[PDB]
mmCIF file of all heavy atoms in Angstrom:
data_model
loop_
_atom_site.group_PDB
_atom_site.id
_atom_site.type_symbol
_atom_site.label_atom_id
_atom_site.label_comp_id
_atom_site.label_asym_id
_atom_site.label_seq_id
_atom_site.Cartn_x
_atom_site.Cartn_y
_atom_site.Cartn_z
ATOM 1 N N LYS P 3 -28.507 12.765 -9.469
ATOM 2 C CA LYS P 3 -29.838 12.912 -8.856
ATOM 3 C C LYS P 3 -29.704 13.394 -7.444
ATOM 4 O O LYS P 3 -30.209 14.478 -7.081
ATOM 5 C CB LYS P 3 -30.550 11.491 -8.825
ATOM 6 C CG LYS P 3 -30.302 10.695 -10.096
ATOM 7 C CD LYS P 3 -30.687 11.449 -11.341
ATOM 8 C CE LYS P 3 -32.010 12.187 -11.200
ATOM 9 N NZ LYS P 3 -32.314 12.989 -12.414
ATOM 10 N N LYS P 4 -29.032 12.672 -6.529
ATOM 11 C CA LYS P 4 -28.961 12.996 -5.159
ATOM 12 C C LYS P 4 -27.650 13.642 -4.725
ATOM 13 O O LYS P 4 -27.647 14.666 -4.050
ATOM 14 C CB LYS P 4 -29.173 11.765 -4.262
ATOM 15 C CG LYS P 4 -30.449 11.048 -4.534
ATOM 16 C CD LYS P 4 -30.612 9.836 -3.480
ATOM 17 C CE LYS P 4 -32.074 9.416 -3.394
ATOM 18 N NZ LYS P 4 -32.431 8.407 -4.406
ATOM 19 N N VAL P 5 -26.568 13.054 -5.096
ATOM 20 C CA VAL P 5 -25.229 13.663 -4.880
ATOM 21 C C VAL P 5 -25.048 14.887 -5.842
ATOM 22 O O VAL P 5 -25.469 14.807 -7.031
ATOM 23 C CB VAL P 5 -24.136 12.650 -5.131
ATOM 24 C CG1 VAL P 5 -22.788 13.236 -4.747
ATOM 25 C CG2 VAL P 5 -24.336 11.427 -4.341
ATOM 26 N N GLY P 6 -24.536 15.969 -5.311
ATOM 27 C CA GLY P 6 -24.348 17.121 -6.126
ATOM 28 C C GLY P 6 -22.887 17.511 -6.281
ATOM 29 O O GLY P 6 -22.139 16.917 -7.047
ATOM 30 N N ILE P 7 -22.496 18.558 -5.565
ATOM 31 C CA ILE P 7 -21.115 19.036 -5.551
ATOM 32 C C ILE P 7 -20.230 18.061 -4.801
ATOM 33 O O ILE P 7 -18.974 18.184 -4.776
ATOM 34 C CB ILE P 7 -21.041 20.443 -4.989
ATOM 35 C CG1 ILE P 7 -19.793 21.136 -5.390
ATOM 36 C CG2 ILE P 7 -21.193 20.432 -3.475
ATOM 37 C CD1 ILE P 7 -19.604 22.526 -4.887
ATOM 38 N N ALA P 8 -20.831 17.062 -4.131
ATOM 39 C CA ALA P 8 -20.039 16.028 -3.454
ATOM 40 C C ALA P 8 -19.742 14.877 -4.313
ATOM 41 O O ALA P 8 -19.268 13.808 -3.840
ATOM 42 C CB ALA P 8 -20.855 15.563 -2.183
ATOM 43 N N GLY P 9 -19.991 15.007 -5.603
ATOM 44 C CA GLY P 9 -19.635 13.994 -6.608
ATOM 45 C C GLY P 9 -18.204 13.860 -6.955
ATOM 46 O O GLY P 9 -17.889 12.953 -7.768
ATOM 47 N N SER P 10 -17.357 14.732 -6.489
ATOM 48 C CA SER P 10 -15.911 14.558 -6.604
ATOM 49 C C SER P 10 -15.273 13.545 -5.677
ATOM 50 O O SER P 10 -14.074 13.296 -5.822
ATOM 51 C CB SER P 10 -15.211 15.900 -6.434
ATOM 52 O OG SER P 10 -15.577 16.842 -7.435
ATOM 53 N N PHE P 11 -16.037 12.938 -4.792
ATOM 54 C CA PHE P 11 -15.485 12.044 -3.816
ATOM 55 C C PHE P 11 -15.657 10.584 -4.134
ATOM 56 O O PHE P 11 -15.270 9.743 -3.369
ATOM 57 C CB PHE P 11 -16.149 12.341 -2.441
ATOM 58 C CG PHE P 11 -15.821 13.706 -1.905
ATOM 59 C CD1 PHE P 11 -16.838 14.477 -1.375
ATOM 60 C CD2 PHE P 11 -14.526 14.159 -1.976
ATOM 61 C CE1 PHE P 11 -16.527 15.729 -0.886
ATOM 62 C CE2 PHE P 11 -14.263 15.414 -1.418
ATOM 63 C CZ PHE P 11 -15.262 16.200 -0.893
ATOM 64 N N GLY P 12 -16.245 10.310 -5.305
ATOM 65 C CA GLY P 12 -16.533 8.920 -5.631
ATOM 66 C C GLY P 12 -17.371 8.213 -4.679
ATOM 67 O O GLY P 12 -18.380 8.735 -4.260
ATOM 68 N N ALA P 13 -16.923 7.034 -4.177
ATOM 69 C CA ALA P 13 -17.627 6.317 -3.233
ATOM 70 C C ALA P 13 -16.805 6.074 -1.931
ATOM 71 O O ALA P 13 -16.929 5.066 -1.289
ATOM 72 C CB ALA P 13 -18.031 4.902 -3.782
ATOM 73 N N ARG P 14 -15.995 7.107 -1.541
ATOM 74 C CA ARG P 14 -15.231 6.982 -0.358
ATOM 75 C C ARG P 14 -16.009 7.627 0.852
ATOM 76 O O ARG P 14 -16.886 8.497 0.635
ATOM 77 C CB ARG P 14 -13.827 7.624 -0.516
ATOM 78 C CG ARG P 14 -13.059 7.098 -1.747
ATOM 79 C CD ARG P 14 -11.673 7.666 -1.919
ATOM 80 N NE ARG P 14 -11.617 8.961 -2.610
ATOM 81 C CZ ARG P 14 -11.788 9.162 -3.918
ATOM 82 N NH1 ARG P 14 -12.086 8.120 -4.721
ATOM 83 N NH2 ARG P 14 -11.763 10.341 -4.424
ATOM 84 N N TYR P 15 -15.550 7.331 2.081
ATOM 85 C CA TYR P 15 -15.820 8.030 3.291
ATOM 86 C C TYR P 15 -17.162 7.779 3.986
ATOM 87 O O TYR P 15 -17.382 8.126 5.121
ATOM 88 C CB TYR P 15 -15.643 9.572 3.176
ATOM 89 C CG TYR P 15 -14.410 10.003 2.350
ATOM 90 C CD1 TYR P 15 -14.570 10.746 1.180
ATOM 91 C CD2 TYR P 15 -13.121 9.651 2.781
ATOM 92 C CE1 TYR P 15 -13.457 11.166 0.489
ATOM 93 C CE2 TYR P 15 -12.023 10.064 2.069
ATOM 94 C CZ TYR P 15 -12.193 10.797 0.946
ATOM 95 O OH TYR P 15 -11.085 11.174 0.192
ATOM 96 N N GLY P 16 -18.083 7.063 3.270
ATOM 97 C CA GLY P 16 -19.419 6.925 3.922
ATOM 98 C C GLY P 16 -20.402 7.993 3.444
ATOM 99 O O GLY P 16 -20.051 9.088 3.089
ATOM 100 N N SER P 17 -21.673 7.592 3.502
ATOM 101 C CA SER P 17 -22.678 8.469 2.949
ATOM 102 C C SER P 17 -23.143 9.583 3.925
ATOM 103 O O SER P 17 -23.573 10.637 3.467
ATOM 104 C CB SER P 17 -23.879 7.613 2.502
ATOM 105 O OG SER P 17 -24.525 6.973 3.576
ATOM 106 N N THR P 18 -23.030 9.363 5.226
ATOM 107 C CA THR P 18 -23.324 10.389 6.152
ATOM 108 C C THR P 18 -22.279 11.510 6.096
ATOM 109 O O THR P 18 -22.633 12.693 6.295
ATOM 110 C CB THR P 18 -23.461 9.860 7.608
ATOM 111 O OG1 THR P 18 -24.692 9.167 7.683
ATOM 112 C CG2 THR P 18 -23.386 10.945 8.643
ATOM 113 N N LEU P 19 -21.033 11.183 5.865
ATOM 114 C CA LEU P 19 -19.979 12.193 5.881
ATOM 115 C C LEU P 19 -19.969 12.953 4.527
ATOM 116 O O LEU P 19 -19.565 14.090 4.535
ATOM 117 C CB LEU P 19 -18.627 11.549 6.146
ATOM 118 C CG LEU P 19 -18.411 11.308 7.633
ATOM 119 C CD1 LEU P 19 -17.174 10.456 7.919
ATOM 120 C CD2 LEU P 19 -18.276 12.669 8.340
ATOM 121 N N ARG P 20 -20.392 12.337 3.445
ATOM 122 C CA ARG P 20 -20.495 13.058 2.178
ATOM 123 C C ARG P 20 -21.675 14.012 2.160
ATOM 124 O O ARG P 20 -21.684 14.888 1.274
ATOM 125 C CB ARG P 20 -20.579 12.064 1.000
ATOM 126 C CG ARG P 20 -19.200 11.659 0.439
ATOM 127 C CD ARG P 20 -19.324 10.704 -0.748
ATOM 128 N NE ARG P 20 -19.808 9.394 -0.428
ATOM 129 C CZ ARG P 20 -21.019 8.933 -0.819
ATOM 130 N NH1 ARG P 20 -21.791 9.628 -1.562
ATOM 131 N NH2 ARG P 20 -21.400 7.711 -0.512
ATOM 132 N N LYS P 21 -22.655 13.863 3.004
ATOM 133 C CA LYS P 21 -23.696 14.790 3.139
ATOM 134 C C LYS P 21 -23.380 16.043 3.962
ATOM 135 O O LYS P 21 -23.898 17.106 3.711
ATOM 136 C CB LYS P 21 -25.010 14.147 3.668
ATOM 137 C CG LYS P 21 -25.414 12.946 2.945
ATOM 138 C CD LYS P 21 -25.323 13.110 1.423
ATOM 139 C CE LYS P 21 -25.787 11.873 0.635
ATOM 140 N NZ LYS P 21 -24.844 10.727 0.737
ATOM 141 N N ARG P 22 -22.422 15.896 4.890
ATOM 142 C CA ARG P 22 -21.928 17.069 5.634
ATOM 143 C C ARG P 22 -21.022 17.882 4.651
ATOM 144 O O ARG P 22 -21.038 19.100 4.741
ATOM 145 C CB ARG P 22 -21.161 16.647 6.824
ATOM 146 C CG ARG P 22 -22.067 16.382 8.061
ATOM 147 C CD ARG P 22 -21.223 15.914 9.235
ATOM 148 N NE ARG P 22 -20.345 16.865 9.806
ATOM 149 C CZ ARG P 22 -19.347 16.605 10.637
ATOM 150 N NH1 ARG P 22 -19.110 15.357 11.048
ATOM 151 N NH2 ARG P 22 -18.576 17.585 11.048
ATOM 152 N N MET P 23 -20.261 17.228 3.761
ATOM 153 C CA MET P 23 -19.415 17.970 2.858
ATOM 154 C C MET P 23 -20.291 18.771 1.794
ATOM 155 O O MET P 23 -19.923 19.857 1.410
ATOM 156 C CB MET P 23 -18.492 16.991 2.099
ATOM 157 C CG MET P 23 -17.306 16.520 2.903
ATOM 158 S SD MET P 23 -16.278 17.798 3.681
ATOM 159 C CE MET P 23 -15.573 18.664 2.246
ATOM 160 N N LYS P 24 -21.434 18.200 1.400
ATOM 161 C CA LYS P 24 -22.274 18.831 0.376
ATOM 162 C C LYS P 24 -22.920 20.054 0.929
ATOM 163 O O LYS P 24 -23.093 21.047 0.207
ATOM 164 C CB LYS P 24 -23.285 17.843 -0.149
ATOM 165 C CG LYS P 24 -24.128 18.399 -1.277
ATOM 166 C CD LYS P 24 -25.528 17.799 -1.276
ATOM 167 C CE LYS P 24 -26.306 18.233 -2.496
ATOM 168 N NZ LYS P 24 -27.710 17.770 -2.437
ATOM 169 N N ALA P 25 -23.367 20.075 2.160
ATOM 170 C CA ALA P 25 -24.079 21.212 2.705
ATOM 171 C C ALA P 25 -23.133 22.424 2.852
ATOM 172 O O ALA P 25 -23.443 23.522 2.452
ATOM 173 C CB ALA P 25 -24.674 20.871 4.053
ATOM 174 N N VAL P 26 -21.930 22.206 3.479
ATOM 175 C CA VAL P 26 -21.041 23.339 3.676
ATOM 176 C C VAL P 26 -20.359 23.774 2.436
ATOM 177 O O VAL P 26 -19.868 24.966 2.384
ATOM 178 C CB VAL P 26 -19.966 23.064 4.762
ATOM 179 C CG1 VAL P 26 -20.575 22.840 6.095
ATOM 180 C CG2 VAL P 26 -19.072 21.884 4.336
ATOM 181 N N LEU P 27 -20.247 22.961 1.418
ATOM 182 C CA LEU P 27 -19.573 23.339 0.202
ATOM 183 C C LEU P 27 -20.352 24.156 -0.739
ATOM 184 O O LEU P 27 -19.817 24.856 -1.580
ATOM 185 C CB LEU P 27 -19.112 22.013 -0.540
ATOM 186 C CG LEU P 27 -17.758 21.510 -0.163
ATOM 187 C CD1 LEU P 27 -17.283 20.439 -1.204
ATOM 188 C CD2 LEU P 27 -16.664 22.581 -0.075
ATOM 189 N N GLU P 28 -21.704 24.072 -0.590
ATOM 190 C CA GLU P 28 -22.584 24.966 -1.452
ATOM 191 C C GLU P 28 -22.513 26.416 -1.021
ATOM 192 O O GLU P 28 -22.449 27.334 -1.840
ATOM 193 C CB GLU P 28 -24.010 24.399 -1.467
ATOM 194 C CG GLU P 28 -24.259 23.489 -2.556
ATOM 195 C CD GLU P 28 -25.296 22.467 -2.228
ATOM 196 O OE1 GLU P 28 -25.671 22.427 -1.017
ATOM 197 O OE2 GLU P 28 -25.720 21.721 -3.126
ATOM 198 N N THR P 29 -22.595 26.646 0.306
ATOM 199 C CA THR P 29 -22.563 28.040 0.784
ATOM 200 C C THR P 29 -21.144 28.649 0.711
ATOM 201 O O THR P 29 -20.993 29.842 0.691
ATOM 202 C CB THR P 29 -23.138 28.123 2.173
ATOM 203 O OG1 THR P 29 -22.230 27.498 3.090
ATOM 204 C CG2 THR P 29 -24.476 27.543 2.266
ATOM 205 N N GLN P 30 -20.126 27.791 0.690
ATOM 206 C CA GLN P 30 -18.775 28.283 0.666
ATOM 207 C C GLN P 30 -18.332 28.765 -0.715
ATOM 208 O O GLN P 30 -17.564 29.747 -0.783
ATOM 209 C CB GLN P 30 -17.845 27.198 1.189
ATOM 210 C CG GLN P 30 -16.402 27.555 1.150
ATOM 211 C CD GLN P 30 -15.527 26.336 1.167
ATOM 212 O OE1 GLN P 30 -15.468 25.570 2.097
ATOM 213 N NE2 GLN P 30 -14.807 26.096 0.107
ATOM 214 N N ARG P 31 -18.751 28.100 -1.769
ATOM 215 C CA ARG P 31 -18.313 28.406 -3.117
ATOM 216 C C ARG P 31 -19.318 29.198 -3.940
ATOM 217 O O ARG P 31 -19.178 29.306 -5.144
ATOM 218 C CB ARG P 31 -17.989 27.107 -3.859
ATOM 219 C CG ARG P 31 -16.859 26.333 -3.192
ATOM 220 C CD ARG P 31 -16.362 25.191 -4.045
ATOM 221 N NE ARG P 31 -15.220 24.528 -3.479
ATOM 222 C CZ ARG P 31 -14.920 23.203 -3.604
ATOM 223 N NH1 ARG P 31 -15.751 22.458 -4.331
ATOM 224 N NH2 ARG P 31 -13.859 22.740 -3.081
ATOM 225 N N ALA P 32 -20.315 29.816 -3.248
ATOM 226 C CA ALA P 32 -21.298 30.648 -3.980
ATOM 227 C C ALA P 32 -20.829 32.048 -4.082
ATOM 228 O O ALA P 32 -19.785 32.454 -3.545
ATOM 229 C CB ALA P 32 -22.642 30.575 -3.239
ATOM 230 N N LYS P 33 -21.618 32.863 -4.799
ATOM 231 C CA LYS P 33 -21.310 34.291 -5.041
ATOM 232 C C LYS P 33 -22.435 35.132 -4.379
ATOM 233 O O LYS P 33 -23.583 34.754 -4.453
ATOM 234 C CB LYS P 33 -21.222 34.638 -6.526
ATOM 235 C CG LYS P 33 -19.841 34.503 -7.110
ATOM 236 C CD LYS P 33 -19.665 35.354 -8.354
ATOM 237 C CE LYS P 33 -19.424 34.484 -9.543
ATOM 238 N NZ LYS P 33 -18.772 35.192 -10.680
ATOM 239 N N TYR P 34 -22.026 36.253 -3.827
ATOM 240 C CA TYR P 34 -22.957 37.070 -3.038
ATOM 241 C C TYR P 34 -22.919 38.524 -3.539
ATOM 242 O O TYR P 34 -21.930 38.975 -4.142
ATOM 243 C CB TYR P 34 -22.622 37.038 -1.542
ATOM 244 C CG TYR P 34 -22.567 35.711 -0.939
ATOM 245 C CD1 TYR P 34 -21.415 34.941 -0.941
ATOM 246 C CD2 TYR P 34 -23.726 35.119 -0.396
ATOM 247 C CE1 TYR P 34 -21.404 33.700 -0.428
ATOM 248 C CE2 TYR P 34 -23.653 33.834 0.177
ATOM 249 C CZ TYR P 34 -22.493 33.158 0.147
ATOM 250 O OH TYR P 34 -22.409 31.904 0.654
ATOM 251 N N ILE P 35 -23.999 39.265 -3.304
ATOM 252 C CA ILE P 35 -24.120 40.648 -3.770
ATOM 253 C C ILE P 35 -23.372 41.555 -2.813
ATOM 254 O O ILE P 35 -23.525 41.437 -1.553
ATOM 255 C CB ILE P 35 -25.581 41.019 -3.913
ATOM 256 C CG1 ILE P 35 -26.249 40.296 -5.043
ATOM 257 C CG2 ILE P 35 -25.730 42.507 -4.054
ATOM 258 C CD1 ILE P 35 -27.763 40.419 -5.102
ATOM 259 N N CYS P 36 -22.583 42.456 -3.377
ATOM 260 C CA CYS P 36 -21.934 43.467 -2.528
ATOM 261 C C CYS P 36 -22.969 44.442 -2.038
ATOM 262 O O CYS P 36 -23.938 44.753 -2.676
ATOM 263 C CB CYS P 36 -20.843 44.163 -3.318
ATOM 264 S SG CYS P 36 -19.933 45.405 -2.355
ATOM 265 N N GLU P 37 -22.680 44.979 -0.799
ATOM 266 C CA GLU P 37 -23.524 45.996 -0.260
ATOM 267 C C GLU P 37 -23.130 47.407 -0.620
ATOM 268 O O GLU P 37 -24.047 48.305 -0.627
ATOM 269 C CB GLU P 37 -23.606 45.851 1.247
ATOM 270 C CG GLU P 37 -24.605 46.709 1.935
ATOM 271 C CD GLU P 37 -24.705 46.429 3.409
ATOM 272 O OE1 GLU P 37 -23.961 45.547 3.900
ATOM 273 O OE2 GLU P 37 -25.628 47.057 4.115
ATOM 274 N N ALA P 38 -21.862 47.646 -0.906
ATOM 275 C CA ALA P 38 -21.385 48.991 -1.228
ATOM 276 C C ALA P 38 -21.649 49.322 -2.703
ATOM 277 O O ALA P 38 -22.120 50.447 -3.012
ATOM 278 C CB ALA P 38 -19.930 49.135 -0.879
ATOM 279 N N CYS P 39 -21.360 48.417 -3.614
ATOM 280 C CA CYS P 39 -21.469 48.667 -5.008
ATOM 281 C C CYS P 39 -22.704 48.019 -5.595
ATOM 282 O O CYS P 39 -23.227 48.495 -6.628
ATOM 283 C CB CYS P 39 -20.239 48.213 -5.756
ATOM 284 S SG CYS P 39 -19.905 46.426 -5.750
ATOM 285 N N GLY P 40 -23.230 46.959 -4.963
ATOM 286 C CA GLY P 40 -24.435 46.349 -5.440
ATOM 287 C C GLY P 40 -24.269 45.323 -6.523
ATOM 288 O O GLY P 40 -25.238 44.950 -7.195
ATOM 289 N N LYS P 41 -23.064 44.852 -6.755
ATOM 290 C CA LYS P 41 -22.736 43.831 -7.807
ATOM 291 C C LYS P 41 -22.493 42.490 -7.144
ATOM 292 O O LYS P 41 -22.183 42.412 -5.976
ATOM 293 C CB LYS P 41 -21.600 44.288 -8.639
ATOM 294 C CG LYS P 41 -21.946 45.369 -9.617
ATOM 295 C CD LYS P 41 -20.866 45.716 -10.566
ATOM 296 C CE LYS P 41 -20.130 46.982 -10.187
ATOM 297 N NZ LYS P 41 -19.546 47.635 -11.341
ATOM 298 N N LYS P 42 -22.659 41.411 -7.940
ATOM 299 C CA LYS P 42 -22.684 40.078 -7.435
ATOM 300 C C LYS P 42 -21.263 39.460 -7.546
ATOM 301 O O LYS P 42 -21.002 38.557 -8.353
ATOM 302 C CB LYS P 42 -23.722 39.291 -8.191
ATOM 303 C CG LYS P 42 -23.994 37.887 -7.659
ATOM 304 C CD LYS P 42 -23.438 36.849 -8.580
ATOM 305 C CE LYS P 42 -24.175 36.783 -9.896
ATOM 306 N NZ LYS P 42 -23.656 35.761 -10.828
ATOM 307 N N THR P 43 -20.399 39.911 -6.712
ATOM 308 C CA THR P 43 -18.966 39.586 -6.858
ATOM 309 C C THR P 43 -18.229 39.373 -5.551
ATOM 310 O O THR P 43 -17.018 39.678 -5.449
ATOM 311 C CB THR P 43 -18.226 40.650 -7.645
ATOM 312 O OG1 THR P 43 -18.640 41.975 -7.147
ATOM 313 C CG2 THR P 43 -18.602 40.539 -9.099
ATOM 314 N N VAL P 44 -18.889 38.817 -4.545
ATOM 315 C CA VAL P 44 -18.208 38.542 -3.257
ATOM 316 C C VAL P 44 -17.841 37.058 -3.187
ATOM 317 O O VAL P 44 -18.695 36.213 -3.487
ATOM 318 C CB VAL P 44 -19.084 38.970 -2.065
ATOM 319 C CG1 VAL P 44 -18.459 38.500 -0.755
ATOM 320 C CG2 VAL P 44 -19.276 40.442 -2.056
ATOM 321 N N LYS P 45 -16.641 36.758 -2.781
ATOM 322 C CA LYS P 45 -16.146 35.433 -2.611
ATOM 323 C C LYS P 45 -15.287 35.323 -1.338
ATOM 324 O O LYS P 45 -14.881 36.366 -0.768
ATOM 325 C CB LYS P 45 -15.297 34.910 -3.784
ATOM 326 C CG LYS P 45 -16.056 34.751 -5.112
ATOM 327 C CD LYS P 45 -16.023 36.056 -5.910
ATOM 328 C CE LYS P 45 -16.587 35.861 -7.284
ATOM 329 N NZ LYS P 45 -16.501 37.148 -8.115
ATOM 330 N N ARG P 46 -15.027 34.128 -0.953
ATOM 331 C CA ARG P 46 -14.255 33.856 0.287
ATOM 332 C C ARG P 46 -12.803 33.749 -0.020
ATOM 333 O O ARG P 46 -12.394 33.098 -0.967
ATOM 334 C CB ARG P 46 -14.746 32.624 0.975
ATOM 335 C CG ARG P 46 -14.314 32.486 2.445
ATOM 336 C CD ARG P 46 -14.422 31.090 2.922
ATOM 337 N NE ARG P 46 -13.337 30.247 2.342
ATOM 338 C CZ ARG P 46 -12.811 29.157 2.937
ATOM 339 N NH1 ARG P 46 -13.253 28.766 4.142
ATOM 340 N NH2 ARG P 46 -11.859 28.448 2.357
ATOM 341 N N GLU P 47 -11.918 34.368 0.818
ATOM 342 C CA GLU P 47 -10.493 34.271 0.664
ATOM 343 C C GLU P 47 -9.901 33.166 1.562
ATOM 344 O O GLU P 47 -9.231 32.288 1.091
ATOM 345 C CB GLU P 47 -9.827 35.632 0.918
ATOM 346 C CG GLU P 47 -10.233 36.640 -0.009
ATOM 347 C CD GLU P 47 -10.096 36.300 -1.460
ATOM 348 O OE1 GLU P 47 -9.008 35.804 -1.811
ATOM 349 O OE2 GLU P 47 -11.044 36.467 -2.294
ATOM 350 N N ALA P 48 -10.123 33.349 2.887
ATOM 351 C CA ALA P 48 -9.777 32.324 3.884
ATOM 352 C C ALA P 48 -10.929 32.148 4.867
ATOM 353 O O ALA P 48 -12.003 32.694 4.559
ATOM 354 C CB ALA P 48 -8.446 32.761 4.574
ATOM 355 N N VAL P 49 -10.717 31.494 5.912
ATOM 356 C CA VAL P 49 -11.759 31.358 6.941
ATOM 357 C C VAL P 49 -12.043 32.717 7.555
ATOM 358 O O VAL P 49 -11.170 33.284 8.196
ATOM 359 C CB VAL P 49 -11.423 30.277 7.985
ATOM 360 C CG1 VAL P 49 -11.719 28.875 7.436
ATOM 361 C CG2 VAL P 49 -9.985 30.393 8.365
ATOM 362 N N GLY P 50 -13.264 33.231 7.378
ATOM 363 C CA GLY P 50 -13.649 34.482 7.963
ATOM 364 C C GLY P 50 -13.248 35.773 7.180
ATOM 365 O O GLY P 50 -13.237 36.855 7.778
ATOM 366 N N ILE P 51 -12.956 35.651 5.914
ATOM 367 C CA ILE P 51 -12.548 36.794 5.109
ATOM 368 C C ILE P 51 -13.226 36.713 3.749
ATOM 369 O O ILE P 51 -12.931 35.852 2.950
ATOM 370 C CB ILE P 51 -11.018 36.871 4.946
ATOM 371 C CG1 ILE P 51 -10.330 36.756 6.282
ATOM 372 C CG2 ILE P 51 -10.654 38.168 4.281
ATOM 373 C CD1 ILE P 51 -8.917 37.071 6.184
ATOM 374 N N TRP P 52 -14.173 37.659 3.467
ATOM 375 C CA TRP P 52 -14.902 37.731 2.264
ATOM 376 C C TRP P 52 -14.573 39.037 1.523
ATOM 377 O O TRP P 52 -14.492 40.103 2.190
ATOM 378 C CB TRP P 52 -16.379 37.609 2.538
ATOM 379 C CG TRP P 52 -16.755 36.293 3.211
ATOM 380 C CD1 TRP P 52 -16.571 36.026 4.550
ATOM 381 C CD2 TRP P 52 -17.350 35.127 2.633
ATOM 382 N NE1 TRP P 52 -17.002 34.774 4.830
ATOM 383 C CE2 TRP P 52 -17.503 34.187 3.662
ATOM 384 C CE3 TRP P 52 -17.771 34.841 1.359
ATOM 385 C CZ2 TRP P 52 -18.009 32.945 3.431
ATOM 386 C CZ3 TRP P 52 -18.294 33.554 1.139
ATOM 387 C CH2 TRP P 52 -18.429 32.646 2.189
ATOM 388 N N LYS P 53 -14.348 38.993 0.286
ATOM 389 C CA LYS P 53 -13.852 40.110 -0.508
ATOM 390 C C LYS P 53 -14.560 40.263 -1.824
ATOM 391 O O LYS P 53 -15.032 39.272 -2.405
ATOM 392 C CB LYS P 53 -12.343 39.975 -0.749
ATOM 393 C CG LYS P 53 -11.739 41.103 -1.484
ATOM 394 C CD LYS P 53 -10.343 40.805 -1.905
ATOM 395 C CE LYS P 53 -9.874 41.860 -2.895
ATOM 396 N NZ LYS P 53 -8.386 41.879 -2.979
ATOM 397 N N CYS P 54 -14.642 41.532 -2.273
ATOM 398 C CA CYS P 54 -15.320 41.836 -3.564
ATOM 399 C C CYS P 54 -14.268 42.042 -4.635
ATOM 400 O O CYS P 54 -13.297 42.703 -4.406
ATOM 401 C CB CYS P 54 -16.176 43.049 -3.426
ATOM 402 S SG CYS P 54 -17.317 43.280 -4.763
ATOM 403 N N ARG P 55 -14.477 41.428 -5.803
ATOM 404 C CA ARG P 55 -13.488 41.537 -6.900
ATOM 405 C C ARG P 55 -13.546 42.915 -7.552
ATOM 406 O O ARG P 55 -12.596 43.377 -8.151
ATOM 407 C CB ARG P 55 -13.702 40.447 -7.930
ATOM 408 C CG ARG P 55 -12.899 39.193 -7.707
ATOM 409 C CD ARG P 55 -13.670 38.136 -6.975
ATOM 410 N NE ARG P 55 -13.118 36.813 -7.160
ATOM 411 C CZ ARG P 55 -12.319 36.216 -6.244
ATOM 412 N NH1 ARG P 55 -12.036 36.825 -5.152
ATOM 413 N NH2 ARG P 55 -11.857 35.010 -6.510
ATOM 414 N N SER P 56 -14.727 43.572 -7.485
ATOM 415 C CA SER P 56 -14.810 44.982 -7.966
ATOM 416 C C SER P 56 -15.085 45.852 -6.751
ATOM 417 O O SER P 56 -16.058 45.620 -6.068
ATOM 418 C CB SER P 56 -15.920 45.054 -9.027
ATOM 419 O OG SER P 56 -17.176 44.860 -8.469
ATOM 420 N N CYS P 57 -14.244 46.906 -6.605
ATOM 421 C CA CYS P 57 -14.253 47.822 -5.496
ATOM 422 C C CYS P 57 -13.421 47.318 -4.354
ATOM 423 O O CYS P 57 -13.151 48.093 -3.450
ATOM 424 C CB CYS P 57 -15.599 48.321 -5.025
ATOM 425 S SG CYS P 57 -16.353 47.459 -3.649
#
Side-chain angles (χ1 to χ4, degrees):
Chain P
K3 325 304 316 176
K4 304 186 160 85
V5 186
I7 199 179
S10 293
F11 296 134
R14 309 182 275 288
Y15 316 119
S17 63
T18 286
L19 279 170
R20 272 183 291 111
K21 306 317 183 288
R22 277 176 68 195
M23 285 307 295
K24 183 210 188 189
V26 296
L27 269 193
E28 268 150 350
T29 68
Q30 177 201 294
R31 300 188 172 150
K33 270 202 244 203
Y34 305 90
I35 290 169
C36 182
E37 187 175 2
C39 63
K41 285 188 259 207
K42 188 253 291 179
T43 44
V44 173
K45 292 91 172 181
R46 196 200 73 153
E47 298 307 311
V49 279
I51 307 190
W52 301 77
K53 182 191 166 158
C54 196
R55 267 97 161 98
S56 68
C57 93

